[PDB]
Design a protein around this motif. Structure first.
Motif, PDB file in Angstrom:
ATOM      1  N   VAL A  31     -13.094 -13.143  -4.817  1.00 49.95           N
ATOM      2  CA  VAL A  31     -14.164 -12.281  -4.217  1.00 49.95           C
ATOM      3  C   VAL A  31     -15.354 -12.922  -3.826  1.00 49.95           C
ATOM      4  O   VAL A  31     -15.908 -12.493  -2.833  1.00 49.95           O
ATOM      5  N   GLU A 100       0.120  -5.670   4.765  1.00 47.52           N
ATOM      6  CA  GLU A 100      -0.416  -4.665   3.984  1.00 47.52           C
ATOM      7  C   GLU A 100      -0.448  -4.623   2.698  1.00 47.52           C
ATOM      8  O   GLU A 100      -1.199  -4.260   1.735  1.00 47.52           O
ATOM      9  N   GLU A 101       0.328  -5.497   1.975  1.00 39.69           N
ATOM     10  CA  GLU A 101       0.370  -5.665   0.549  1.00 39.69           C
ATOM     11  C   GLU A 101      -0.725  -7.025   0.130  1.00 39.69           C
ATOM     12  O   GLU A 101      -1.427  -6.696  -0.885  1.00 39.69           O
ATOM     13  N   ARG A 104      -4.289  -4.630   0.592  1.00 38.80           N
ATOM     14  CA  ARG A 104      -4.543  -3.900  -0.473  1.00 38.80           C
ATOM     15  C   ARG A 104      -4.747  -4.714  -1.969  1.00 38.80           C
ATOM     16  O   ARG A 104      -5.522  -4.420  -2.555  1.00 38.80           O
ATOM     17  N   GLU A 110      -6.418   0.933   1.198  1.00 37.60           N
ATOM     18  CA  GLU A 110      -5.316   1.211   2.251  1.00 37.60           C
ATOM     19  C   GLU A 110      -6.057   1.087   3.800  1.00 37.60           C
ATOM     20  O   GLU A 110      -5.078   1.519   4.604  1.00 37.60           O
ATOM     21  N   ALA A 113      -3.397  -0.253   6.760  1.00 39.79           N
ATOM     22  CA  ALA A 113      -2.701   0.571   7.540  1.00 39.79           C
ATOM     23  C   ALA A 113      -3.383   1.251   8.793  1.00 39.79           C
ATOM     24  O   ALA A 113      -3.144   1.215   9.698  1.00 39.79           O
ATOM     25  N   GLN A 117      -2.618   0.442  12.827  1.00 42.59           N
ATOM     26  CA  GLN A 117      -2.679   1.445  13.839  1.00 42.59           C
ATOM     27  C   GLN A 117      -3.227   1.315  14.838  1.00 42.59           C
ATOM     28  O   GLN A 117      -2.983   1.344  16.221  1.00 42.59           O
ATOM     29  N   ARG A 121      -2.034  -0.053  18.833  1.00 40.39           N
ATOM     30  CA  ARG A 121      -2.559   0.885  20.197  1.00 40.39           C
ATOM     31  C   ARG A 121      -3.183  -0.164  21.266  1.00 40.39           C
ATOM     32  O   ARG A 121      -2.868   0.055  22.408  1.00 40.39           O
ATOM     33  N   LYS A 191     -13.688   4.185   8.168  1.00 46.86           N
ATOM     34  CA  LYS A 191     -13.024   4.135   6.916  1.00 46.86           C
ATOM     35  C   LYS A 191     -13.279   2.694   6.334  1.00 46.86           C
ATOM     36  O   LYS A 191     -13.464   2.886   5.002  1.00 46.86           O
TER      37      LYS A 191
END
Ligand SMILES: Cc1ccc(-n2cc(CNCC3CCCCC3)c3ccccc32)cc1
Ligand SMILES: Cc1ccc(-n2cc(CNCC3CCCCC3)c3ccccc32)cc1
Ligand SMILES: Cc1ccc(-n2cc(CNCC3CCCCC3)c3ccccc32)cc1
Ligand SMILES: Cc1ccc(-n2cc(CNCC3CCCCC3)c3ccccc32)cc1
Ligand SMILES: Cc1ccc(-n2cc(CNCC3CCCCC3)c3ccccc32)cc1
Ligand SMILES: Cc1ccc(-n2cc(CNCC3CCCCC3)c3ccccc32)cc1
Lengths: 218, 218, 218, 218, 218, 218
Positions: A31, A100-101, A104, A110, A113, A117, A121, A191
């Motif tokens: 981190v 995605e794994e 997270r 999340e 995701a 998206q 696009r 987000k």
């Protein structure tokens, strides 16, 4: 740098490619190392913004307000471009590609995701390197901050960058197809921002870190 | 209603003007009566979407997913349009015009500010009734729901409505200026939506109300 | 299937044992795999509900509202039964048995403690396989959703399933001892639901996923 | 007072009717005076529990743990009982009857809906004063606190009160119909409790107020 | 033990060193083991408080209210002292020393940064073992709980412990330099407390665990 | 203005009394006018800090970081001072005196209780105007911002103001009694700050408002 608004678009586009932030490495990462990456993502976004033709012609208060509202859209769009030649994966750094794994598990909740998206696009459009840097400078000028004093001036900057994008695509659906991905860009950046507000990494509100670095560069 | 996509834009525009929801009255008003208004706003947004050329030709699952993601954008844009000939006030209904002090007193928290920011943006453009109904059908088609199955079919609807807006403006910067207000529209509708999720009026999640009404009309 | 309410209870009980969902495997598991498990837990709960005598006699809107309010009570009770022959551990799948440390390390926060409290309650009673499937069908019919239009019909279904449980235990404290674990079942299911609302796995609200699958099966 | 468990149910029921808290007045009312009411509601719920046959024979730690978990269920059930002969209104006090509009105006958010849903459920049963006081003592004994030491001793109290309710109804579906309203009672009391935790009236956590008053009476 | 307020400070200081909690070991550790550590941190803080001269002279309700408000300040200050001879690390137990990465990986969110800021503050002062135990007893007596009935008595205890600290430093800036770290101590303890409220370890509110153990020792 | 640190305390104290912000009126009041008050409170807190001997000699980044962390402590302490000759009421302005019922009705939630607790604490000390302005300058200098670069320079300012308060009281328990109210001051200001963050009045984060005003005055 407003002479670039007066000349032909090709020199503006090439200026935008030259002021693109230097590729960043993370060095699965601890981190502390991701915190270091974030810190440098902030510095880099600020020095970039100062090199957008017109931006420095806004007063310091409006420069700050504009950046607070859109700095994460600039970052998110950076991540999304670098990820176009990838499948179900995100290039968070030169040496950090996560699905995605891994997103997270690296501590991004999340957001994977949401970011994928946005990537899909932009991929459905064959986003060019030149369009990307026109779309990125236009996303910054499209700030909707309630703290903006001189609205006219911000509007002027955005119209010029809009023109520039139209002058690029000229020499009509193409320009709009890129603009129509902007609502999702803002939503995805909100987000990401809300995530990092919740984390409050090392006791620090992202807003408070951005203001101090903006203060160093201004 | 896709015969309207193969014809001249005039027949499409007047059709969009014809399928506008019937003007809504609230009858300072009690929460019960504002609850009633909200209930009717949901109903009319659904029947309107049913009448958008293209929409009804998605699967029922994609129709619901599309509407869940943008139903409040459609509502918000309605309110902002009716507020264009006003100053620092919002037309929530035919008989309900509230300033920011009235908005917060009627229980909308700080949404008044968010909605006025969007109004100003639309007012700085001389937004016309015809542009409004095209932008509104295009906001619906620009959905970015993670629940969407047939992305190609949504994209196609979106492209046709984009084209139709280009064909309206034809008969270059005008279409793009309207598209650049869409990111704030999404952001503002998300704020409104989050407000009502937190209120949970009469024990009911807005999502759960929309789905049941969508069910009846499908 | 309401003929099963007219006949003797033994054929109803055997129907309920036959409509029990097929045992699910997870394949320590990655989140992608747990997400897949969750997705199949939803499909399976829906097809099961459609096979409860009486449920399909409710209108589609009430079938949905009923399921939204109790689908997680059905799942939680499944997990709890399979865990009765265990000690301080939970059978989340056929190949996934986790104690409180493995529950929290699999990403379920503190739900382990809540689920084990429910397990202990059911264990203090020697819950039979036959009672379990009567208690599970009764928990579904005991929905208290604010969205229910035909309350009488829901009440009728619940009275029949209540009778059925009394007719089972006949051929008086036993029936009530099972019903008295229902408050904790609802409370524990609300906790699980609130957890997964917070997680928002892959950008998806559980409610929004359930409605679409209910739509496929209805 | 456990001599009441070895005798005929009539002496127990009339004892429960005798130890009902004295009717409470509020004297639209100011928050100060509603704060005062809440303060007195806590006091009377404690002295009442002290008078439940069985309760006082738990250890002080189990008595506190039991009451913390269900004190608001006891309160809520009181309010719902006094509301049975009303329509769409709630008797919060002898001089305070509020509809859903008044409930939200008095600062109870959306709890009115939640409480009416419970009222309707009790009204659909012709709930009698004698059934009410048995259900209320049984709600207390049905606690599921994770802090409970002697689970056998709580279970025993619960069984005796269950038996007593069975013996009342004797002198088969009736007892179970009353038990099936308990899950909604728990859910509704949890909502009320969460409301007041978030309000934190006068800087005070309801839990912290209950413990101090429990302390004085123990 | 109020005779220690009447005599010379040296015997009070030595009493405070003797009533210091026995060094605790954790045995990277599993959460079960950290939960065990936490449980013993609570017991130990309570028995310590009972041995502070004056504390037991407050009524039980005020003893509890005082402890609820400051028990985590006592713990945090314990952790901070043991960490003075360390660099960028925290001694959470005798066999548990964690940097900011190990703090967050052990599940403490961003509390590491908050705790290290407090450590640095105390390190900039060469905090003596004797001052530490005077500062710790004074932090407890400086409770600002809204639940305190006898304020005068709490005030008296705090004045005595304040005097004691002045009488120690005598045989004027030194005493105040220690007191000026108290605002950060409270703020850091509120953060720790809010963290563990959010975690709700094994279904338990920290407040609810403290009250029961206070009840055992009182 | 550091010539005031090398002289006799009298010249410093009277300077602090001279640079007190001009008494503020609100003109039950509408939110718009309370928003206006808040806006002016921010402005005057900044110009006041600029006039604290020592403050202006930190770097701009440390000045902002210091003020962000304690600006609300400075405000809150002002309100508490003007409330000393009142009972159960708070002087939010020259023409705005509200009890706890009025505080919550004016939209301050439960902050009234928190502010009165602080008032009582200052009232139990006969706090004098001269002690107040020294405590206020010392609260500012006691910042604990994680964003502070030059900790030595902040410490030095803090020491000088501590010394100055010791030199005032000289010409032993008195200074320490005033310092012991600082932890509650920080806690209360944090509550107020969190209130206004959640309100987000007119779409604006208080942090974002402070920085822009700090910008103008720097
Ligand atoms: C606790 C914690 C600390 C640091 C991070 N963390 C911080 C970064 C830096 N990039 C920030 C945004 C990430 C989303 C796209 C726009 C930029 C990063 C990159 C990859 C994984 C993690 C991670 C995440 C979580
Ligand atoms: C408790 C509560 C109930 C109802 C309402 N409330 C509900 C509505 C209906 N319209 C909803 C949105 C309003 C913002 C723009 C998009 C549509 C409304 C209209 C005006 C004032 C209040 C109010 C607010 C608060
Ligand atoms: C991020 C995340 C993704 C997926 C899961 N996750 C999802 C499931 C599927 N079961 C959902 C409920 C679990 C509690 C009992 C009722 C059903 C599961 C099973 C076991 C461990 C984890 C886990 C948890 C966390
Ligand atoms: C700020 C605030 C203070 C006090 C109250 N408030 C407090 C009470 C006392 N009763 C508490 C519960 C009410 C719901 C059913 C179980 C008992 C009450 C009664 C009626 C209206 C308001 C109100 C609400 C809000
Ligand atoms: C889920 C979870 C369970 C338990 C713990 N957890 C619990 C403790 C015990 N100490 C509590 C406070 C820690 C901060 C300083 C004051 C005392 C601890 C110690 C070290 C790491 C973790 C950890 C953290 C997270
Ligand atoms: C929506 C809303 C807008 C404005 C206010 N509101 C804003 C102020 C200005 N002062 C802010 C703090 C008040 C607490 C002590 C430190 C300073 C004020 C004063 C009195 C009542 C209300 C109120 C409260 C709520």
């Amino acid at each position: 740098l407003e002479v670039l608004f007066q000349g032909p678009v090709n020199a503006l586009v090439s200026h935008l490619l030259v002021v693109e932030p230097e590729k960043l490495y993370a060095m699965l990462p601890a981190v502390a190392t991701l915190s270091d990456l974030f810190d440098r993502e902030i510095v880099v976004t600020i020095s970039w913004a100062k090199s957008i033709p017109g931006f420095s012609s806004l007063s310091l208060s409006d420069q700050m307000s504009v950046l607070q509202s859109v700095w994460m859209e600039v970052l998110v769009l950076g991540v999304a471009q670098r990820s176009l030649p990838l499948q179900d994966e995100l290039a968070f750094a030169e040496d950090l590609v996560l699905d995605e794994e891994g997103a997270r598990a690296a501590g991004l909740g999340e957001l994977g995701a949401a970011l994928l998206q946005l990537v899909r696009r932009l991929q459905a459009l064959r986003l060019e390197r030149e369009e990307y840097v026109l779309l990125k400078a236009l996303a910054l000028a499209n700030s909707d901050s309630v703290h903006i004093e001189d609205a006219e001036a911000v509007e002027q900057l955005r119209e010029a960058l809009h023109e520039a994008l139209l002058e690029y695509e000229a020499g009509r659906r193409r320009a709009g197809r890129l603009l129509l991905t902007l609502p999702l860009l803002r939503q995805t950046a909100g987000k990401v921002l809300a995530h990092f507000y919740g984390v409050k990494l090392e006791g620090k509100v992202p807003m408070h870190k951005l203001f101090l670095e903006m203060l160093e560069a201004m």
